[PDB]
Design an enzyme around this catalytic site. Structure first.
Site, mmCIF file in Angstrom:
data_model
loop_
_atom_site.group_PDB
_atom_site.id
_atom_site.type_symbol
_atom_site.label_atom_id
_atom_site.label_comp_id
_atom_site.label_asym_id
_atom_site.label_seq_id
_atom_site.Cartn_x
_atom_site.Cartn_y
_atom_site.Cartn_z
ATOM 1 N N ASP A 166 0.858 -1.182 0.000
ATOM 2 C CA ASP A 166 0.000 0.000 0.000
ATOM 3 C C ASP A 166 0.895 1.232 0.000
ATOM 4 O OD1 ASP A 166 -3.249 0.535 1.280
ATOM 5 O OD2 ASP A 166 -1.848 2.125 0.719
ATOM 6 N N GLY A 487 72.871 3.978 1.075
ATOM 7 C CA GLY A 487 73.759 3.031 1.719
ATOM 8 C C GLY A 487 74.714 2.433 0.714
ATOM 9 N N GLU A 488 75.683 1.693 1.238
ATOM 10 C CA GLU A 488 76.682 1.047 0.405
ATOM 11 C C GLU A 488 76.169 -0.312 -0.070
ATOM 12 O OE1 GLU A 488 77.593 1.751 3.833
ATOM 13 O OE2 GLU A 488 77.680 3.857 3.229
ATOM 14 N N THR A 489 77.058 -1.091 -0.678
ATOM 15 C CA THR A 489 76.659 -2.374 -1.235
ATOM 16 C C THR A 489 76.520 -3.429 -0.143
ATOM 17 O OG1 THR A 489 77.274 -4.120 -2.791
ATOM 18 C CG2 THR A 489 79.056 -2.954 -1.673
ATOM 19 N N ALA A 490 75.677 -4.427 -0.418
ATOM 20 C CA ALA A 490 75.481 -5.582 0.458
ATOM 21 C C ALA A 490 75.135 -5.156 1.884
ATOM 22 C CB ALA A 490 76.710 -6.493 0.444
ATOM 23 N N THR A 491 74.197 -4.215 2.000
ATOM 24 C CA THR A 491 73.827 -3.661 3.292
ATOM 25 C C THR A 491 72.366 -3.871 3.668
ATOM 26 O OG1 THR A 491 74.155 -1.716 4.706
ATOM 27 C CG2 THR A 491 73.119 -1.375 2.570
ATOM 28 N N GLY A 492 71.534 -4.386 2.768
ATOM 29 C CA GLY A 492 70.188 -4.792 3.116
ATOM 30 C C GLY A 492 69.057 -3.893 2.654
ATOM 31 N N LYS A 493 69.335 -2.867 1.847
ATOM 32 C CA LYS A 493 68.254 -2.029 1.337
ATOM 33 C C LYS A 493 67.313 -2.829 0.447
ATOM 34 C CE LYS A 493 71.437 0.173 -0.879
ATOM 35 N NZ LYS A 493 72.800 -0.279 -0.496
ATOM 36 N N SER A 494 67.864 -3.659 -0.439
ATOM 37 C CA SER A 494 67.015 -4.519 -1.255
ATOM 38 C C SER A 494 66.311 -5.569 -0.408
ATOM 39 C CB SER A 494 67.837 -5.182 -2.358
ATOM 40 O OG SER A 494 68.375 -4.213 -3.240
HETATM 41 N N1 LIG Z 1 70.104 -9.898 8.615
HETATM 42 C C1 LIG Z 1 70.689 -10.582 7.628
HETATM 43 N N2 LIG Z 1 71.248 -11.779 7.915
HETATM 44 C C2 LIG Z 1 71.835 -12.467 6.933
HETATM 45 N N3 LIG Z 1 71.964 -12.143 5.644
HETATM 46 C C3 LIG Z 1 71.402 -10.955 5.389
HETATM 47 C C4 LIG Z 1 70.761 -10.130 6.297
HETATM 48 N N4 LIG Z 1 70.303 -8.978 5.676
HETATM 49 C C5 LIG Z 1 70.673 -9.132 4.428
HETATM 50 N N5 LIG Z 1 71.339 -10.302 4.182
HETATM 51 C C6 LIG Z 1 71.876 -10.758 2.906
HETATM 52 O O1 LIG Z 1 72.983 -9.944 2.571
HETATM 53 C C7 LIG Z 1 72.948 -9.602 1.167
HETATM 54 C C8 LIG Z 1 72.777 -8.110 1.022
HETATM 55 O O2 LIG Z 1 72.344 -7.819 -0.317
HETATM 56 P P1 LIG Z 1 71.319 -6.652 -0.609
HETATM 57 O O3 LIG Z 1 70.075 -6.942 0.138
HETATM 58 O O4 LIG Z 1 71.112 -6.460 -2.112
HETATM 59 O O5 LIG Z 1 72.016 -5.330 -0.082
HETATM 60 P P2 LIG Z 1 72.107 -4.099 -1.029
HETATM 61 O O6 LIG Z 1 72.587 -2.908 -0.272
HETATM 62 O O7 LIG Z 1 70.704 -3.792 -1.625
HETATM 63 N N6 LIG Z 1 73.168 -4.450 -2.277
HETATM 64 P P3 LIG Z 1 73.251 -3.168 -3.376
HETATM 65 O O8 LIG Z 1 71.819 -2.932 -4.005
HETATM 66 O O9 LIG Z 1 74.268 -3.535 -4.520
HETATM 67 O O10 LIG Z 1 73.706 -1.923 -2.685
HETATM 68 C C9 LIG Z 1 71.830 -10.446 0.562
HETATM 69 O O11 LIG Z 1 72.338 -11.682 0.072
HETATM 70 C C10 LIG Z 1 70.886 -10.646 1.747
HETATM 71 O O12 LIG Z 1 70.124 -11.842 1.637
HETATM 72 MG MG LIG Z 2 70.034 -3.845 -4.203
#
Ligand SMILES: Nc1ncnc2c1ncn2[C@@H]1O[C@H](COP(=O)(O)OP(=O)(O)NP(=O)(O)O)[C@@H](O)[C@H]1O
Ligand SMILES: [Mg+2]
Ligand SMILES: Nc1ncnc2c1ncn2[C@@H]1O[C@H](COP(=O)(O)OP(=O)(O)NP(=O)(O)O)[C@@H](O)[C@H]1O
Ligand SMILES: [Zn+2]
Lengths: 769, 463, 52, 53, 52
Positions: A166, A487-494
């Site tokens: 309705d 950061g430098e190389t092999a330092t964990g940024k990736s």
């Molecule tokens: N806490 C951790 N313990 C053990 N291995 C690690 C740790 N953090 C990072 N890694 C290793 O260390 C390496 C660092 O490489 P990467 O993560 O590319 O650093 P990066 O600064 O990005 N290299 P780049 O891009 O050339 O400057 C890789 O093989 C990671 O798996």
């Molecule tokens: Mg890298």
């Protein structure tokens, strides 16, 4: 207005306006719950109607409807009919509220469907009732507006209950019958209550008891069909010839009984034969086919006379608020507990196919042909006029199976997540079991994080800024600063990029350096076009400009990226604007250098430090001797693979959520750190050591003249040679001669004496006596 | 018969669909001309105007095939073209049109007559177009701080008001205005005020067309600034650089025509309409590649004096050469203006200034006195005068002053003319200008003689 | 119709040229604001362009 | 030359001009509104007949 | 080129992202010469020599 708790009652129908204004107790009354019950009990055969005493202050009422079908239905048909009626009416009212009153479809649905009072008339020949929605409140003008759409829904549905709505009693001074009371003094039939509702305030549309689970919102016709086609439809539904044919005209439609030779059993009820013949009636633009005598021998039938079936289906699909049009001209659909849009492959036909389960079976079978689904989609696109805003709540994390509340940590799944129109999702499902604190993956991730940024006293602030930048990615709002992972190389940024990618899922995109180098407006820039409603984008490996040959990163792009909106269009599109909810993170091993530097650039640059090295055992002391790292840790190689396996996704998600909860003082922001990037240090030191000319320092010329300064037209000016001689003790030419001449020409004014003059005085000189 | 043709005729009677001079259609749904060519809106309109039809006709518009048939009929019946927005004194808002003559806003069919496609992009509210408001008083204080009402800053205030109000007029503007300041003197403050005010009709950009060559280029800006009522050019890169490009007088003259020639990106369109009030805000003094009388007619300057300083930086900024007043900062001011609070109050203020300065015209007037090199170029003309018949009979008496006679014309040697002019200007700054003047007004008759048809005014004045 | 100065300055054939292409069957063509040669390094009007 | 009445004397001494008149501020709008379209067309046709025998 | 994702689309196809499962080998007669040298680039270059 806190509602009302006094019931205003009229006794006799058609009471005078003068009587109503004078409030004569002979007909006009006002009670409460107990008084009303006692009055009804003591006076059994008194009429009782309810109205509104004031249309100017107590306009607030509940949602109510009146249904009266002149037929008898059995229990099972009644139950299925009432279920379908509830669903359809709640969807229609919620859609109207959303599109006109600015309310929210989901809370409207919840309030209407939570509970309702449904009476039943003591009469047996017909099924009539009143329905009251207790927890939905609105003004009477809202029902005034609702009248048209409710009539359209009533006219465009096969359900007898919905068809028999309705549409009156939605006028001024509308009066509703009181339950248990006869309408006419000479009749006896009344309305009786039904469980679980037994009180009397459950059945009054003016009594207001607002509580937590409540919601309020506010602002034969020749045109039906050819008669021959109507009779053809009736016969075609009968599936049998009619003995009484070529005698039923337009005028004798509602009079002559119809007789069927039962060659085939009556398809309405599958019964072999019927004692009494079948008859037709015209109600609300439909032919109701019934059988005389036995009310349950044959099931009543409805034959519509107007409308389009594929248009009614499209309207019913549209009023569930599952397809919407955005401000960018894109259609978002609600499939599988998420909002999805895809310009390449429109999903409206997928929505139509999936939504057929929430529709009556009559409309369900038509949505199986792709041609009919395309027709319904074509109808829906035409009905979708105007747009709606999306992604306006910056406190919610949208997962493929719901929405996580950042302020609380509570996960909403299903319709509860539908309110937050989040059109971009992580792409994966949330999991409460894996979203736990105590876990071996959690301890591993804590170890990794403390390894990348140590908790040392010197690092404390940088680590806190690391937490801030990673946490602010969860924010759905717009932030006013960028972050550089230097950061430098092999330092964990990736590694942390992969961690964020696994934690955030599809709310994460990686683009190139074209954003930081080329013109953002330009032409086709799908990289900019991909940052729509993103929360974390990454630009990797910025091509630093230590050596000439490449265009430096332009300041214009970084100033524009800070804006709440970004101007840019994709290929073959007309939209020019996209919302900037994303946090821009650029990964580089080198210090960026901008083309043009000014004041504003000291409010947009935040950089993050990485000072931990992961190395093979061979390069142990080789890395230790380097000053690029403050600590050397052994390198793990399967860590990349297990991160690719998304093993730390929920652990890092929990850590990010806890960081957000800790850092989220009411409203949150980001602050730059303009003391690490070295190219800004030049201007910082110049500002802290050199200032412009002055006119209010005019009565301060004695010490300046004693030192050696000269005066001219109330402006301090000095030759370039002595400028260089004075500046030679602070800045070296072989260091930054290019920058020196850059600021020299930037602040050159020429004139005075015979050589160029600049408006600059030295802070150290004026500081010294 | 042909119900569908009758429906198409009925719809076309209401002028809800138009064909424009770009070979495209504009439709009127939701009280706004929303031109769209990627996806047609004609079927949407056909379904929209369905209840304003007889009941025996409304039932046929529920089928997509029949709606497409009606759309085809409309497309065949249109044929003719119309002109786009021509009214300059009409500001279009997303839900209507505001007449600035009487400051009266109307929507619906009353706003259909002005076929305006471009819009501000935001809605208009009647109840916030009021004289009294906290936003109103705060904004009035802000403007009175930035541009003081003292009798010294009178013409500057009038120029500020006129140029600011001209951003509403939809006509073409014959001058380019300058915002001259020192550091953080409200430049970007008034820029963001305008952005909040109009919106979608204001384009913010830096350099580009101001610096580069307009033609022989794929430059997009020229097409971008089509039917936009205000354009800002900021962050001019200190053309006193000796290596950075200058400002082109040809560019200035191109930017000051009703039609601007440009080739956007990939299309073939070469002309666009010019409505913008181009405002250039600079700290350092602009320097042009070549200045002349025609260029001096298209430049106006507005000076910024009153500056704001933080409590900590008050002692640092309280002593500046070009400052006139020192006041305080405000941390939440930028966020608050981005909260669009001053929007409608500043719209009302702009309308008030527009009404004030339309009596009944608001032609923009150049102010060349602010630019010192323009002042030098005009003082060369004021301190001199071209030779004319009135100077012919003088001859020997004026030649006694140090002049000679050439073809019964008073003439001065180039070296002596250089010696005379060298005692007024600065040689180091104006040597290039002197060479430019010499090569611009030179006269030669043979190997030796070099004639100048100019005479000093003071020589004539002195007996 | 109105056109820029490229018609008198740059190569007519080169690549695409809508500036020249738009002069089809136009009864009058205008170009304005000649780029004064008072700036050193300025271009010059091409005699072959005039002849074309 | 067409000048405002302030700089009229300043621009009179220029030799680039043989005449000076008062600048009119309505000409631009009147032309933009196509007031003189058919008058100019009539003059153009008359000149065409005159100069194309 | 060493990251696990690359960007690029075919003709008549709206697919942009591509996976990186590839061993990238370049056969050459000359040693490569890079514009920028850093400690990071040294982690991504290996050389095999053919001497028969
Ligand atoms: N806490 C951790 N313990 C053990 N291995 C690690 C740790 N953090 C990072 N890694 C290793 O260390 C390496 C660092 O490489 P990467 O993560 O590319 O650093 P990066 O600064 O990005 N290299 P780049 O891009 O050339 O400057 C890789 O093989 C990671 O798996
Ligand atoms: Mg890298
Ligand atoms: N009335 C006022 N009261 C308080 N603070 C104000 C007031 N007006 C302006 N400010 C502040 O002072 C600043 C002045 O900066 P502004 O002049 O707008 O930008 P800008 O620095 O000149 N841009 P640019 O010329 O490119 O460097 C504003 O951003 C406000 O923060
Ligand atoms: Zn039956």
């Amino acid at each position: 207005i806190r509602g009302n708790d006094v019931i205003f009652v009229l006794k006799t129908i058609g009471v005078p306006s003068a009587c109503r204004q004078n409030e004569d107790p002979r007909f006009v009354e006002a009670f409460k719950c107990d008084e009303l019950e006692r009055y009804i009990d003591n006076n059994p055969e008194c009429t009782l109607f309810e109205s509104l005493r004031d249309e100017e202050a107590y306009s607030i009422v509940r949602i109510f409807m009146d249904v009266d079908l002149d037929a008898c239905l059995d229990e099972i048909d009644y139950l299925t009919a009432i279920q379908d009626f509830i669903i359809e009416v709640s969807n229609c009212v919620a859609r109207f509220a959303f599109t006109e009153c600015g309310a929210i479809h989901e809370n409207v649905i919840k309030s209407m469907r939570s509970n309702f009072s449904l009476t039943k008339s003591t009469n047996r020949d017909k099924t009539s009732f009143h329905i009251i929605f207790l927890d939905t409140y609105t003004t009477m003008d809202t029902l005034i507006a609702m009248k048209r759409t409710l009539l359209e829904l009533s006219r465009s549905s096969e359900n007898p209950l919905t068809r028999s709505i309705d549409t009156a009693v939605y006028r001024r001074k509308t009066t509703l019958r009181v339950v248990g009371t006869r309408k006419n003094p000479n009749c006896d039939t009344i309305h009786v209550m039904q469980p679980p509702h037994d009180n009397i305030e459950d059945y009054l549309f003016t009594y207001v008891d607002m509580n937590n689970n409540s919601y309020y919102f506010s602002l034969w016709e020749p045109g039906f069909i050819s008669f021959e086609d109507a009779i053809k439809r009736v016969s075609k539904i009968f599936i049998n010839s009619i003995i009484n044919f070529n005698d039923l005209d337009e005028n004798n439609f509602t009079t002559v009984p119809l007789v069927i030779d039962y060659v085939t059993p009556c398809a309405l009820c599958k019964k072999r034969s019927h004692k009494h013949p079948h008859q037709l009636s015209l109600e609300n633009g439909a032919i109701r086919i019934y059988k005389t005598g036995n009310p349950h021998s044959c099931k009543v039938k409805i034959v519509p006379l107007d409308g389009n079936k594929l248009f009614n289906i499209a309207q019913r699909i549209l009023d569930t608020n599952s397809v919407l049009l955005t401000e960018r001209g894109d259609h978002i659909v609600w499939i599988n507990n998420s909002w999805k849009f895809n310009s390449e492959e429109p999903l409206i036909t997928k929505l139509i196919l999936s939504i057929r389960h929430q529709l009556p079976k009559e409309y369900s079978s038509e949505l199986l042909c792709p041609r009919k689904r395309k027709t319904v989609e074509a109808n829906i696109r035409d009905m979708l006029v105007d747009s709606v805003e999306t992604d306006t709540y910056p406190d919610k994390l949208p997962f493929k199976n719901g929405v996580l509340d950042l302020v609380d940590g509570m996960f909403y799944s299903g319709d509860d997540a539908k309110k937050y129109t989040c059109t971009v999702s992580t792409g994966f499902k949330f999991d409460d079991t894996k979203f736990v604190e105590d876990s071996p993956e959690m301890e591993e991730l804590m170890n990794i994080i403390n390894d990348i940024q140590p908790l040392t006293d010197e690092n404390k602030k940088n680590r806190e800024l690391y937490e801030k930048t990673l946490s602010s990615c969860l924010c759905g709002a717009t932030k006013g600063c960028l972050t550089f992972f230097f950061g430098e190389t092999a330092t964990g940024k990736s590694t942390t990029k992969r961690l964020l990618k696994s934690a955030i899922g599809d709310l994460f995109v990686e683009t190139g350096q074209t954003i930081l180098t080329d013109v953002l407006d330009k032409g086709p820039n799908p990289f900019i076009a991909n940052m729509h409603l993103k929360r974390s984008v990454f630009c990797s490996e910025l091509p630093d400009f230590a050596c000439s040959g490449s265009k430096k990163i332009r300041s214009d792009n970084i100033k524009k990226l800070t804006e709440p909106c970004v101007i840019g269009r994709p290929c073959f599109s007309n939209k020019i604007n996209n919302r900037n909810h994303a946090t821009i993170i650029i990964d580089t091993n080198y210090k960026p250098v901008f083309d043009r530097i000014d004041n504003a650039l000291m409010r947009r640059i935040a950089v993050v430090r990485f000072r931990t090295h992961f190395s093979q055992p061979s390069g142990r002391e080789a890395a230790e001797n380097n000053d690029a790292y403050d600590k050397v840790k052994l390198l793990d190689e399967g860590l990349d693979g297990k991160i690719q396996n998304n093993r730390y996704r929920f652990a890092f998600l929990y850590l990010l959520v806890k960081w957000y909860k800790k850092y989220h003082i009411p409203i949150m922001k980001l602050y730059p750190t303009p003391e690490e990037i070295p190219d800004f240090a030049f201007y910082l030191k110049i500002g802290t050591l050199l200032v412009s000319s002055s006119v209010k320092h005019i009565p301060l010329m004695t010490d300046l003249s004693k030192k050696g300064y000269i005066l001219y037209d109330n402006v301090v000016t000095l030759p370039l040679t002595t400028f260089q001689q004075k500046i030679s003790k602070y800045f070296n030419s072989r260091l930054f001669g290019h920058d020196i001449e850059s600021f020299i020409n930037r602040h050159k004014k020429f004139a005075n004496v015979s050589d160029e003059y600049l408006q600059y005085i030295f802070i150290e000189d004026i500081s010294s006596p």
